[PDB]
Design a protein around this ligand. Structure first.
Ligand SMILES: Nc1nc2c(ncn2[C@@H]2O[C@H](COP(=O)(O)OP(=O)(O)O)[C@@H](OP(=O)(O)OP(=O)(O)O)[C@H]2O)c(=O)[nH]1
Ligand SMILES: [Mg+2]
Length: 561
């Protein structure tokens, strides 16, 4: 009794029918999405918790999964599953949740349900349990009409098969109704009338308005408070309730500054629920003050603490990242998930109005049981068949181990790889031009494991390094084309230590561009960041970035060799 509850989270790539599907289930029942939709189906109560967009919204994806006992993956019947919902699905699997797959928009012409079933099945190469990829039921749906069915040619007149599937395959909450009250805050909310609102799934006991309560944070500090209002979810709404009990997803009111991972307990049985998530970072990278002779030239805020300041503001936007204090009091060791994670952070701090020097990204090594390990990750690539042998050749040099390949039948092909992050770093640049911009690459962290012995191929070419500061003249540049490709044309302002071109040969060449042209190479941030070597840096400024050596002068470099 009182276990007719079904707490489920819903996942769907944008414009795949998740707002429209839940919108049916609501109107066909006895009861933008809301962060939670409550649904009455006969005597079952279904909580459909919405998942956020496909950026790390502070890691709300783990918070949401912490409140649900199953996940509902909605998939377009033609386009199939999209890579953007990779990580949300991944985390649902990490929380041991078994999925319910809804294949929507099945009434569209060209719909290929058989194909998207295989795609979704294959996508569950999220090293997930046999258990999870086993026996995930499949419901076909056309929410535009409101049709659900276990087959797509045979189909019910409404959404009943979906309800039934939810009831049948979603476990009831693992909660104790008789124990003392216990509830962890999973999300927060505010209304100028009520104050701060705390949201979670009651793990134990029951709660009434005006009940006395004790809140314990992660570390173990406690305070006493009196709950004001207990708000239960009904439609897209919250009504005041006189009673909420274990398994219920509700919102609480009378408590003060509730923090996510706070545990609300009966005053005499205070027991904190374990703080839940952390994406351990896997790629480190150094942010530095821009030591260039172009200090404050194109960027407003450029100081040591000026950077460290914002280096403790984005800490809360993001638990995947860390920030550390280096001994050089003008440079900092910031780590993240992928190189893509840290990259756009700069591209934002760029037009956030900054100026900083940044190293090349390296994997964070870890020692486990005396044996050092590194991060490996899953890579899937979609190229044409003309590049097939080419990108295959390249990935093997970066210690990529081929696991699968699947021709499109229409001239393309998808490859699958297990690769150390070490070998994958900065590939995208080499990928696109190689595949001429048509190929597609996706990556997902898998596991740490014993390092692959050896090193990845270095840059091979050397760089043309400026010997002085001034405006580059076309007269000189024309002479440099005899021995490489350039990064600028006539009239560009340069200083000493700056890298201005790519040497045709292997060694670094200090060159003078101060004493008509072929088109210059302009490098995007990512592009240029993949180019940089360990003894070099990228200088980033609000409308463009420069490539520079660590030691700016000829003499200093020679000493360091
Ligand atoms: N053929 C077919 N189409 C479906 C179905 N379900 C949803 N759609 C289409 O997708 C659109 C709904 O967008 P959602 O898919 O619900 O948005 P969401 O991913 O963020 O949840 C509808 O038009 P829309 O509301 O005008 O889109 P928009 O203007 O809100 O972006 C409708 O055209 C279906 O079962 N069959
Ligand atoms: Mg929309």
């Amino acid at each position: 009794m009182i276990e007719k509850l079904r707490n489920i989270a819903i996942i769907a790539h944008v414009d795949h029918g998740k707002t429209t599907l839940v919108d049916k289930l609501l109107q066909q029942s006895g009861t933008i999405l809301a962060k939670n939709t409550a649904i009455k189906w006969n005597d079952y109560r279904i909580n459909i918790v919405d998942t956020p967009g496909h950026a790390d919204f502070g890691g709300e994806v783990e918070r949401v999964m912490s409140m649900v006992d199953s996940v509902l993956l909605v998939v377009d019947a033609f386009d199939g599953p999209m890579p953007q919902t990779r990580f949300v699905t991944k985390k649902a699997f990490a929380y041991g949740l078994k999925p319910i797959v809804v294949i929507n928009k099945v009434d569209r012409p060209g719909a290929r349900p058989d194909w998207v079933v295989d795609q979704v099945f294959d996508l569950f190469v999220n090293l997930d349990a046999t258990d999870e990829q086993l026996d995930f039921p499949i419901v076909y749906a056309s929410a535009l009409n409101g049709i659900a069915g276990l087959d797509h040619e045979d189909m019910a007149e409404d959404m009943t098969p979906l309800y039934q599937a939810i009831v049948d395959h979603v476990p009831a909450p693992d909660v104790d109704l008789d124990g003392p009250f216990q509830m962890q805050i999973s999300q927060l909310d505010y209304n100028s009338y009520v104050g701060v609102i705390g949201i979670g799934r009651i793990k134990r006991g029951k709660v009434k308005p005006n009940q006395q309560v004790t809140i314990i944070d992660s570390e173990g500090k406690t305070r006493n408070a009196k709950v004001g209002k207990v708000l239960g979810h009904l439609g897209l709404e919250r009504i005041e309730t006189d009673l909420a009990e274990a398994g219920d997803i509700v919102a609480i009111t009378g408590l003060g500054e509730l923090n996510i991972s706070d545990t609300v307990c009966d005053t005499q049985n205070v027991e904190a629920l374990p703080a839940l998530s952390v994406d351990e970072p896997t790629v480190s990278m150094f942010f530095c003050v821009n030591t260039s002779p172009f200090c404050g030239k194109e960027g407003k805020f450029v100081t040591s603490r000026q950077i460290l300041d914002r280096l403790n503001k984005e800490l809360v936007h993001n638990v995947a990242l860390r920030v550390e204090e280096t001994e050089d009091a003008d440079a900092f060791r910031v780590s993240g998930r992928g190189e893509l994670h840290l990259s756009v952070l700069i591209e934002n701090m760029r037009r956030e109005g900054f100026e900083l020097a940044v190293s090349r990204p390296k994997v964070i090594f870890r020692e486990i049981d005396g044996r050092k390990q590194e991060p490996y990750e899953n890579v899937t690539l979609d190229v044409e068949e003309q590049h097939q042998g080419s990108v295959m050749q390249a990935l093997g040099e970066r210690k990529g181990d081929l696991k699968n390949m699947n021709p499109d039948g229409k001239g393309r092909v998808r490859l699958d790889y297990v690769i150390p992050s070490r070998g994958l770093i900065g590939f995208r640049s080499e990928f696109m031009t190689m595949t001429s911009g048509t190929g597609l690459l996706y990556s997902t962290f898998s596991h740490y494991d014993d390092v692959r012995p050896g090193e990845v191929g270095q840059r091979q070419n050397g760089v043309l390094i400026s010997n002085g500061q001034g405006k580059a003249v076309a007269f000189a540049l024309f002479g440099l084309q005899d021995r490489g490709k350039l990064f600028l044309g006539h009239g560009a302002e340069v200083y000493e230590g700056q890298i201005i071109g790519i040497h045709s040969r292997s060694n670094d060449l200090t060159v003078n561009c101060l004493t008509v042209l072929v088109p210059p190479i302009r490098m995007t941030l990512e592009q240029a960041l993949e180019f940089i070597d360990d003894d070099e840096l990228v200088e980033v400024t609000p409308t463009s970035i420069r490539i520079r050596k660590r030691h700016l002068t000829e003499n200093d470099r020679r000493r360091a060799n």
